Structure formats: structure tokens, C-alpha cells
Amino acid sequence: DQLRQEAEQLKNQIRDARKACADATLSQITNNIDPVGRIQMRTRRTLRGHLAKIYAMHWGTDSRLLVSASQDGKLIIWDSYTTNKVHAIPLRSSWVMTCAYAPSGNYVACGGLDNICSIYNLKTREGNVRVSRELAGHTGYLSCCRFLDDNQIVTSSGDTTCALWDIETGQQTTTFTGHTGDVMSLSLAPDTRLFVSGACDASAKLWDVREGMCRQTFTGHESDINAICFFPNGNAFATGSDDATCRLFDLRADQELMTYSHDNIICGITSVSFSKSGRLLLAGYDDFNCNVWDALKADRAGVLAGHDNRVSCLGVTDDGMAVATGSWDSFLKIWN
Amino acid sequence: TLSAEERAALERSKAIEKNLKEDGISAAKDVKLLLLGADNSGKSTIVKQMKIITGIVETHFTFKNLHFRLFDVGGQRSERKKWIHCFEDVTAIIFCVDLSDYNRMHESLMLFDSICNNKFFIDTSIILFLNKKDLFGEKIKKSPLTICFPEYTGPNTYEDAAAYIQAQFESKNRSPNKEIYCHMTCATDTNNAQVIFDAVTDIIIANNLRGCGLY
């Protein structure tokens, strides 16, 4: 009972300190920057071959190779330039919710409702793709696998916790706890030393991969957070929730900078991605179309559209040349 | 596709696509059903021809040249709103209710109410199974059907009591284009597969009728 009072006063101290740092909103300082106009993006490629809903997609580090997981139980690696299928990996469980690509192109980790993160080796001497390691230890559905190196991966689950794994040994090196709801997404910072995870408790909190410490927590959303992605400089991140609102939080100021809500938007955000410059905030919505937000003025700088069903995944190449979108209509479209 | 190496890469892609289409053909002869219900309600012992295969449990019994795949979602112990949309394309929903449990009956009704009126399952027909007729028949004599349902007013006979429970479950439908196929089952019933088969065939006709434009 006494500690409960201590908990409350600590929140008041944080709120007062957080409010005292606020001097001017982001939309008030950059009011003199000229708008970026209309970003009209045209479909350049249409990747077909999936026979079920597409739930995840990750870009290769060379901005040419893609990976996509679907309910059909197939894992396809695409040549994004010539639309050729490089690999086709049959999964054990057809219920895959996330699917990641290694930064070196050697491995691919891709898992889901089976509570297991399966890692596949592409550069094998036998010419086929084999299941190198199956990571187990999560009691809930898996989401947002992210490779750190060729032998280190961070995973998120519905156990209200995320885990840091060692692919060689197979043991859970570090476990990050503190969430009070299913964790739906995570993103790795460019300096590969920090990451943020968005959970169902309407809170995203910054975690340290080396120490396993919740350095900071961020609030403001009214519903569960569905997606997250860092600003390109690794000093801010953007979240997407079922509240049909996008928000930009700053790690140094510990306060949200601006909101990306529009009166015509009803359905929540599914995916969040940034451009190479950090100016266009692309977000996928449940009303079958993606919107491009000017991340500095909260102005809709065009709409992608085109898809027939809910857009479930977004992806921007490392060089920023194209944007890949996946939806439940079993089609991947590449925009530019 | 100009270079010699790129010509073989295109040949590899076309060979991959052939197997992708072939696997899709073999994935159209199976019926995907969803198992739901409270614990200890017989949701794992409906058909004695199991041929099963913590998390998701599959069951792939076959009947009359048709493949039935049953997905048991129990044991996840997570928020259903985040992964129940994966089963948006299931043919039907199989719900199991235990008539001898007077305490979990209200818990079962909450489960049925949430699932039936879910936004993803607004058109998926439900095959509702009422289990353990004999156990319920003996239980009602010892304790009347009034502690669980204080609003009951009809005769204390088995026929009226069992039908009264059925009416409550169908009172939660509240939607068109959805039909609830009920059936009373016991422990020593072998024709559960036959009951599922005729309901699934009946559900397919309704969806085909809407697609053809007749209705």
C-alpha cells in the first residue's frame, strides 16, 4: 500500500518533468519549411504466386531480394528487379505471422503461431534450403523477428515479453519483461544496440539489448500499438495503432512530437515505415490503401491505393529506391 | 532473360511456379474447420477417428473422399483479437457445449456470443454440438435446471430442458446469412463425422448460392 503511493508520485514527477521540457511543438517550429507537394507513386512491379493472405515481408540488404510469408505455408524469395522466384521454402506450420531476412543474406528466420522461430540456411552446400535451428521457449504467438547478426536474433511474442536468442547454442540469452499485454511489433535501431517494442497495452518502451533494461517508456496511444519503426538517424520512432493514429516519439525528449491523424481515417494502422531521408512516413491501413505522411507537417502527401484487401506489411529498400507492399489478396506490389 | 545464366534463372522460376500451382490444387480438396468451446466439453474427442498428425493442434480425419482439417485454438491463453483473423477463411465453426456443467454454461454462452458476433466470423456458419445427453439426463433429476438458468419456467422434462438450452444459444445469432446446425451428442456416438459432413456440404451450397446470384 505504501509502495503504491510511491508508484503514483514517481509518475507525477515524470509527467511534470516531461511537461517542463516542452517549449514548442514540432508542427510549430517547422512551419516555415516548404511542403513536399504531392508524392505520386506508380506501381512498377506486381509479385504474384502466393495463394493465401500475406502476413509479413522483409527487404534484402542489397535492395534486390525480398522474402514473403503467407498462410499457404510457402516461403518465397523474390528477385525484385526481374520478378523471378529465387527460393521457395515449405514451412511446417501454415500459421506464420512474421518473417525476417538476415543482414548478410545467408539466413532467413520466419515464424508464427507455432510459438517457434524457425531459421533457414540459404547458402548450403547441398543446393537446398534446410532448417538450421528451431528456437523454442515462447508460450505465445511470435511476431517481428529481427536479425542482429548471423548468430543473434531478437523475437517478440504474446507473452508480454521479448527475447534475445543465440542461434548457435539455441538458448535464450536475454529476456525483456515489463509489458502488460501482447507485444505486436519491434524494430532494431541502426546502431544495433537498442530497440523499441510496441505492445497491446498502448505503450512502446525502449529496451537495451546488452543490459536488458527498459531505459524509457512512451505513452499516448488510445488503443493497441500494431507497428513501429525508427527514424533513420536512430533518435526517434513512429508507431501505428488501432486508434487510426500515428505518432512520433523522441528518445531524447521522452515525449511525442506530433500526431498523424486524419478525420477521414477510421481503421487502424497495420504497418509503419520511413523513407531514406526521414521525411515521408508510409503507413498501411485496414481500408486497403496506404497513405504517405509528411513526417514534419502531418500532411497527406499522396496515397498509394491499388490493393484489394488489407495491407499487412510495408517495406522500404535500404537505398530508398522503392517501396514494397503486401496485402491479404496474395499480391506484392513495388512502388516508386 | 538475354544472358545464358539469366535464361536458366527464368527456367528455375517457371519450375518453381509449377510446383506452387500444383500444391494449391492439392490444397483445395480439404475443409478447414475451427474447434471452439469451454474446457472439458469434448472439444478434443468429437470423432473417434482422430489421426491427429502447446499451441495450435490440427486434426486431419477424412470422410467420403473429403479431407476435414480441425484446428483447436485452445491453450494459446492470449488475446483472441490478434490471431483469430488467421481463421477468417474457415468453412465453419464447431462449438462444443457440455450440458452436465451448470457452472461453465454461462461461460460457454459468453464464448458463443463473442465468436458469433465477431466481425471476421459474421458469415461463417456454426456447427453447435451439445454433448453428454445421458449425463445431463441423470443430472436434471437430482438438481433441476434452475440454479444455472433462473428464468426457466417450462416443465422439468428432458425434452423441454434440452431444447431450452438450445434456444439460448441460437438467441445470440442476431445475424443473417448465418445458420446454426445443432445436434445432440453423447459419449458413445460414432456418427459425429457423418453429422459434420452433411452440415459442411449444406454450408457450401449456401455460399455457392450467394456466389451464383440465385439468392
Partner: single-chain antibody
Framework: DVQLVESGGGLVQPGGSRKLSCSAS????????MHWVRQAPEKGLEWVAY????????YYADTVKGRFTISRDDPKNTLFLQMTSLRSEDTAMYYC??????????????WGQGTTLTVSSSDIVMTQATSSVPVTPGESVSISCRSS???????????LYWFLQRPGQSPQLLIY???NLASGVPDRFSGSGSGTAFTLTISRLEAEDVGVYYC?????????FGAGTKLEL
């Protein structure tokens, strides 16, 4: 362990027919394209025929076009080469090579052990400057060969392959496009080039690097090898 073994060699009379079998054990044979390469006595390597994965696309060399035939038995993991009429030119050590083609693949990594066949009594021309180069260990060696056309495709890839045939062994792939090191080769090897002139450099040469070096083009069929540069110590 990847292993290709060939059998069916021997002494045959002119005008007869022989069949060579290449049984594979250690890799997914059904996904690889298999070539036949023959090496005449102390003359050099020469491409013969190629069958694609799934027996879809089949090619033959102009020398033995319409005379040889290639067949593929995927369930048995065996590759055949039936020769109808044999002259005195057919005598050579026939090798069996696997090849897989996709974005970023290595289509000439593994060569078979080779079988010896003895018989009793337009195209891209690649030329190697020299035939014998004496050198001592620790000295960098540069090997260069030219070509008729420009192997640099419009896609940005240059189709040049460098092989090393140690004495008494089978050729081993070192560089497969212009500078892409093969799997398991030492990092001291490096390659470069510009369109029609290419160079292979070996820094900090070791005693086991001696042998005959061949440069081959894969821009267009038929495949043509170089004259062959021999390193002496």
C-alpha cells in the same frame, strides 16, 4: 559430402558406342544442371554438353552436335552420356560438373573425378597470353586472358570463370563472375577485368597454388575455355 563419380571409361574401337554414367550422392541432384567437360591429353579442357534442371533445356557442342546425347535420371541420381560414333578425337578425361542458376549462385563450384576414355587408331575465342610461368613462393603472380566479344552484359555482370587444375586432380572454381571468390578458396586470390581484358592475381603465393589455370566464359553457349596457363616452381 558432395561426391560425383563417373564410370564407363575404357578402350573402344572407332565406330562403336559407349555410355558414361555420373552418379551423384550428397546434394539435391534434381535441382542442379549438369555439364560434361572433357580434357584431351596435355591439351586442355573443352565443354561438351549441358542439360538443364528437369531435362528442359539441352545443348551440345558444335564438334559433337548430333553425335552425342545426354539423359537425366533424377529419381536415380545418375547422369548419362551416350556417344554414338567415336573418332580418335573423342579420347579425353570426361568430367561431370554440377551447376545451379539463380541470382548470386555459383554454377561451377564442384567438378567430378573424371573418367578416362581411350579410342584406338562465330564462337567467343578466349586466348591466354602465356603457357608457363616460373615463380618462387611469396611473389605475386598475375594471369591474364582476353576474349573476342565483351563479356560485360548490359545487366552489369561479367561472365568469366577462373579454374585451377592441380596436378593429378580435377579443376576447382576460384572466381566465377569477375571478382567473386568461390566457397572455401583462400582469400589471397583476386580477380578483375574490363570488358575484354581480365587479370587474375595471386598475392602471397603458396606451394599448393601450382597448377594449370583456365579462364572460361559463360556469356553464350557453347562454352569456351582458355589455352591454359601453367605455374612452375
Amino acid at each position: 559430402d558432395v561426391q560425383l563419380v563417373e564410370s564407363g571409361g575404357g578402350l573402344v574401337q572407332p565406330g562403336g558406342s559407349r555410355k558414361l554414367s555420373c552418379s551423384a550422392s550428397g546434394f539435391a541432384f534434381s535441382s542442379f544442371g549438369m555439364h560434361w567437360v572433357r580434357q584431351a591429353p596435355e591439351k586442355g579442357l573443352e565443354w561438351v554438353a549441358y542439360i538443364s534442371s528437369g531435362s528442359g533445356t539441352i545443348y551440345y557442342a558444335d564438334t559433337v552436335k548430333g553425335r552425342f546425347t545426354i539423359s537425366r535420371d533424377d529419381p536415380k541420381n545418375t547422369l548419362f552420356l551416350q556417344m554414338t560414333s567415336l573418332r580418335s578425337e573423342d579420347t579425353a578425361m570426361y568430367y561431370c560438373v554440377r551447376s545451379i542458376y539463380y541470382y548470386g549462385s555459383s554454377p561451377f563450384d564442384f567438378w567430378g573425378q573424371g573418367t578416362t576414355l581411350t579410342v584406338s587408331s562465330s564462337d567467343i575465342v578466349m586466348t591466354q597470353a602465356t603457357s608457363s610461368v616460373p615463380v618462387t613462393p611469396g611473389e605475386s603472380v598475375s594471369i591474364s586472358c582476353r576474349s573476342s566479344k565483351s563479356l560485360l552484359h548490359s545487366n552489369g555482370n561479367t561472365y568469366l570463370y577462373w579454374f585451377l587444375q592441380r596436378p593429378g586432380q580435377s579443376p576447382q572454381l576460384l572466381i566465377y563472375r569477375m571478382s567473386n571468390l568461390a566457397s572455401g578458396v583462400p582469400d589471397r586470390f583476386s580477380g578483375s577485368g574490363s570488358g575484354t581484358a581480365f587479370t587474375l592475381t595471386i598475392s602471397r603465393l603458396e606451394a599448393e597454388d601450382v597448377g594449370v589455370y583456365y579462364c572460361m566464359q559463360h556469356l553464350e553457349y557453347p562454352l569456351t575455355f582458355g589455352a591454359g596457363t601453367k605455374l612452375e616452381l
